[PDB]
Design a protein around this ligand. Structure first.
Ligand code: CA
Lengths: 476, 102, 407
RNA sequence: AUUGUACACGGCCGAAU
DNA sequence: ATTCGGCCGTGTACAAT
């Protein structure tokens, strides 16, 4: 008595109203949704003189075009066009003179010469942040800064081997600490390992010391990296195509992250809504509340103050409260949360609201007859609980990009929800195509849920009560 | 302006200029590859502002695509377009070659 | 049975005959779908290897006779809005059987009108060797995908419907939890673990008086009521006992074939003998075998087919989920220390066919378990307390183009 | 950390005995 | 102690049959 469904691939919007189901093809034909005023994206580079020169050649190399890494599947592994009429971003990625800061060989030896791994990461962050402050206040003002870490620095910071004895195992993450400690800088930063802009480079894995890491083909790496660079430059590449007769809706994803002590649990939230006109806003905020514990769920007061904050952010762009508010959460909605959220809606006069728990650990799954799994977008209704396959066989790609069979997303709406699960699944599936961190659209999790977790990693190192930018470009 | 040149007809036999004008816009690429280019056809996406200018024009307008790498020239009437999208043109490498044969 | 089944459905059957002798492939697709009804691929007559070029076909049937504006030059047929990939719109006559194809990559100004198929140059003859082949598209750099336009597929689900007995025995006890009462049970005879104790209450699908659990249960307070008052109720505790009772009943059942890991929640096949291979015989509508409890050939370690059996309540009905997994042992009984490399190695290689086969195996094992042997006391005089049954296949509306993909 | 999935391992939380 | 539910965190393998 389970009713099946296969949703069509949601249409994305590019360029001057162009529509396509694939971010790569849509960008290739129509270009970015928000075109830049100017044909150059000034990219600053921080790293050793080898990596700074190495990455700069890579940026020019992408301008000349990169041959596809697998011609058998030309949709899953397409070739980067270049600077022709097929330019995905209609702009030039150049490094202007004076926009490079060189990490001297002496400075690398200071970081590598420290015994304790934690001290090395902290010392490296201060060293990099000082160089980062030099770039922003200089004459050459970049739009996005690329940190091309050298191989010896990656060995010390990531693999920690150059290792000391393990003390608890909660080793600091250099990327998250660096992103948090430079949140006050006005320009977003991007970390790029040498093996992505140079196929010759090889960094061994941390534990498996005898094996290098395996990376995607060069064309795919250029696609994902430059798309992130374009987004961090201050423009939205693509947006979901809006239905003409749709309720003005705001999506709010709620997630949790362990505190640095490893025991307490904080709440990190992300909000998605399209501004008036052709645009899409992705905010990342932490609930300004003091109720500390280990519970992976919110309290009645905590949820109410959180929803009120999200509504106010929406009202700043639209000057009117949203018609619909869809709240996606990584854990089951409890009674205190639902009544807390409903209290916030009543004060703001919100008409309809959906409370959906996006569970990934559900063991329920379906299997078609063959060697490939079910189509992406397959939906099965289980007495209200929705089984959605955001990952699976993609007809556009011609294959299924995964190792084992995909694990479907189980959507469990709370009883205090308006829309049917079929309607919610169509929105959840559509939300997976606006992550902007990758050009491959068969993403498993919806963007508000995913964006909430990405914000959480950075905010573990930001002390509570410190005001930080809500722009998602500083966390992706 | 919107157009890059004007073609004026002339009878090849008597040499008399017929006086009929024809607007021409030329897009030049260097070793590029048009969107979804097979060995017999390809496509092209017109800018929305170009369409608005061409509608107001009082003379016919053709769009000519020139590639320096292979010295290939293709042409198509701007009003002619794919039935689906107003901004999309489907060129055929056999019938749309820009040359004295056309 | 549609009114057009005689005409529309069987119309495409005769169209394939023209292409069958021509030598071009015809791949079945959706009947009334947007864009294609069949696929044409050029092929080399000498070898038959694929050439990597495709083309779609759409056919719509009509009645016998002529159409609007038909003299002895051509006719005039309209194309309805609901039908990328350019496709030939092949027609079909009934008075004298003359098919009429026409392209869609062609641009006669705007195509938004009536497609007047010519009666002189739109005849679908074996001349399509180079004529139709000129239009065929390729799966190279432009990136033409194969949209799924099919009658869908039949997918199976992990759920098995559980039919609980119409009666359940509920009784009090001077014990709080089963752990507090298990030492009381073991010292007596006729030991049976298929029961749950919580809140000083005793729940079991069997009558406690008949079997050896008389010591724990208050033998005068054994009352049998319907399961709808204990299982299908909103009480959170009652759900938890039902979760406990279902597993233990499944645990005691199938004991001839499976073993339970206490630290985990994993069911796995037990090994007959010591450190030797094994096999199982399960249904598909076919007889299939598989190494359920298999010792390796390269070394001596033993891998047992495993599954995490969990119960869910959907639509006021109880279902059992099957989650395939593996359990590795040095000799079939002692758990294999450091099994991460072996466990992760096998998981990395399985695909949809492998996991589906494992699910069907566990479905067959449980559904056959509820059945009784013909002879009395062959396995147990009372019938198995749980009856499972496969759910009807899930009818997806779209099919994976597995045939079009490699292999 | 271009990108994510699958897997493995570990920690922890909610309800009642 | 159990039985049921769940969640977040760090690594390797792989680029998809
Ligand atoms: Ca990123």
């Amino acid at each position: 008595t389970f009713k099946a469904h296969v949703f069509d691939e949601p249409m994305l919007e590019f360029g001057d109203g162009g529509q396509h189901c694939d971010p790569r093809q849509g960008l290739r034909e129509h270009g970015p949704l928000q075109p830049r005023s100017g044909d150059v994206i000034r990219v600053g580079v921080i790293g050793t003189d080898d990596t700074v020169a190495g990455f700069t050649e890579f940026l020019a190399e992408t301008g000349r075009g990169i041959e596809s890494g697998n011609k058998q599947l030309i949709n899953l592994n397409p070739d980067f066009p270049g600077l022709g009429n097929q330019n995905p971003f209609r702009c030039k990625f150049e490094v202007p003179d004076g926009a490079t800061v060189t990490i001297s060989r002496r400075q690398v030896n200071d970081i590598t010469g420290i015994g304790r791994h934690d001290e090395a990461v902290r010392h490296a962050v201060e060293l990099i942040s000082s160089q980062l402050s030099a770039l922003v206040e200089g004459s050459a003002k970049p739009d996005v800064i690329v940190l091309a870490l050298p191989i010896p620095l990656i060995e010390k910071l990531v693999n920690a081997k150059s290792d000391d004895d393990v003390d608890g195992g909660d080793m600091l993450n250099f990327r998250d600490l660096l992103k948090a400690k430079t949140l006050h800088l006005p320009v977003p930063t991007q970390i790029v390992w040498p093996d992505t802009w140079d196929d010759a480079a090889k960094i061994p894995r941390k534990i498996k010391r005898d094996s290098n890491r395996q990376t995607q083909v060069k064309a795919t790496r250029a696609w994902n990296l430059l798309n992130a660079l374009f987004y961090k430059a201050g423009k939205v590449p693509w947006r979901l195509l809006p239905d003409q007769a749709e309720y003005r809706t705001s999506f709010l994803g709620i997630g949790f992250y362990r505190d640095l002590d490893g025991q307490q649990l904080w709440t990190s939230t992300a909000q998605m809504f399209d501004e008036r006109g052709r645009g899409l806003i992705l905010r990342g905020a932490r609930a300004q509340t003091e109720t500390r514990g280990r519970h992976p769920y919110l309290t009645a007061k905590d949820a109410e103050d959180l929803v009120v904050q999200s509504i106010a952010a929406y009202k700043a762009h639209h000057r009117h409260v949203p018609a619909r508010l869809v709240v996606l959460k990584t854990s089951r909605f409890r009674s205190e949360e639902a009544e807390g959220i409903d209290a916030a809606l009543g004060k703001s006069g919100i008409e309809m609201s959906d409370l959906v728990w996006v569970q990934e650990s559900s063991p329920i799954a379906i299997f078609r007859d063959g060697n490939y799994p079910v189509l992406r977008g397959t939906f099965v209704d289980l007495d209200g609980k929705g089984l959605l396959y955001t990952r699976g066989s993609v007809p556009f790609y011609g294959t299924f990009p995964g190792l084992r069979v995909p694990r479907p997303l189980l959507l469990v709406p709370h009883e205090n929800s308006d829309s049917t699960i079929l309607t919610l699944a169509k929105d959840v599936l559509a939300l997976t195509k606006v992550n902007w961190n990758t050009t491959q659209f068969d993403q498993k999790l919806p963007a508000p849920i995913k964006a909430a977790r990405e914000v959480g990693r950075i905010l573990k190192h930001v002390e509570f009560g410190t005001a930080v930018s809500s722009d998602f470009r500083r966390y992706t | 302006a919107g157009t890059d040149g004007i073609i004026e007809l002339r009878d090849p036999k008597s040499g008399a200029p017929l006086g009929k004008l024809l607007g021409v816009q030329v897009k030049s690429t260097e070793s590029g590859q048009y969107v979804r280019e097979n060995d017999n056809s390809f496509e092209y996406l017109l800018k929305p502002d170009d369409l608005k200018y061409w509608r107001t024009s009082n003379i016919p307008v053709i769009i000519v695509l020139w590639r320096k790498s292979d010295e290939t020239a293709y042409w198509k009437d701007v009003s002619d377009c794919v039935r689906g999208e107003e901004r999309r043109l489907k060129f055929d490498k056999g019938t749309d070659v820009f040359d004295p044969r056309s | 049975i549609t009114d057009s089944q005689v005409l529309g459905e069987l119309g495409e059957t005769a169209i394939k005959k023209i292409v069958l002798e021509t030598g071009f492939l015809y791949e079945q697709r959706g009947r009334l779908e947007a864009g294609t009804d069949g696929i044409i691929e050029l092929r080399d007559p000498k070898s038959g290897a694929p050439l990597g070029k495709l083309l779609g076909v759409q056919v719509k049937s009509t009645e016998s006779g002529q159409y609007v504006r038909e003299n002895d030059n051509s006719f005039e047929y309209l194309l309805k809005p609901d039908d990328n990939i350019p496709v030939i719109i092949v027609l079909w006559r009934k008075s004298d059987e003359t098919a009429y194809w026409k392209d869609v990559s062609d641009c006669v100004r705007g195509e938004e009108r009536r497609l007047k198929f010519d009666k002189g140059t739109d005849v679908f003859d074996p001349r399509s060797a180079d004529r139709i082949g000129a239009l065929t598209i390729d799966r190279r750099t432009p990136g033409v995908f194969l949209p799924p336009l099919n009658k869908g597929e039949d997918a199976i689900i992990n759920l098995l419907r559980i039919r609980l007995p119409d009666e359940i025995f509920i009784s009090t006890s001077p014990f709080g939890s089963g752990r507090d009462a298990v030492p009381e049970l073991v010292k007596h005879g006729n030991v049976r673990f298929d029961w749950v104790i919580r809140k000083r209450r005793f729940v079991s699908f069997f009558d406690p008086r008949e079997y050896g659990t008389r010591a724990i249960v208050d033998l005068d307070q054994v009352e049998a009521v319907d399961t709808k008052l204990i299982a299908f109720n909103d009480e959170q505790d009652d759900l938890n006992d039902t979760m406990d009772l279902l597993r233990r009943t499944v645990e005691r059942q199938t004991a001839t074939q499976l073993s339970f890991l206490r630290k985990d929640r994993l069911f796995h096949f037990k090994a007959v003998g010591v450190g030797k291979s094994r096999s199982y015989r399960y249904m598909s509508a076919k007889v299939v075998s598989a190494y359920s409890s298999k010792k390796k050939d390269g070394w001596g370690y033993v891998r047992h087919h495993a599954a995490r059996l969990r119960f869910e309540r959907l639509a006021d009905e109880w279902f059992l989920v099957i989650d395939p997994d593996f359990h590795f042992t040095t000799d079939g009984f002692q758990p294999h220390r450091y099994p991460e490399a072996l466990l992760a190695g096998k998981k990395r290689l399985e695909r949809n066919a492998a996991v589906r086969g494992q699910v069907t195996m566990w479905q067959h094992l449980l559904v056959e378990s509820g059945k009784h042997e013909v002879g009395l006391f062959d396995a147990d005089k009372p019938a198995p307390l749980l009856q499972f049954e496969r759910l009807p296949v899930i009818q997806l509306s779209q099919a994976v183009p597995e045939s079009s993909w490699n292999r």
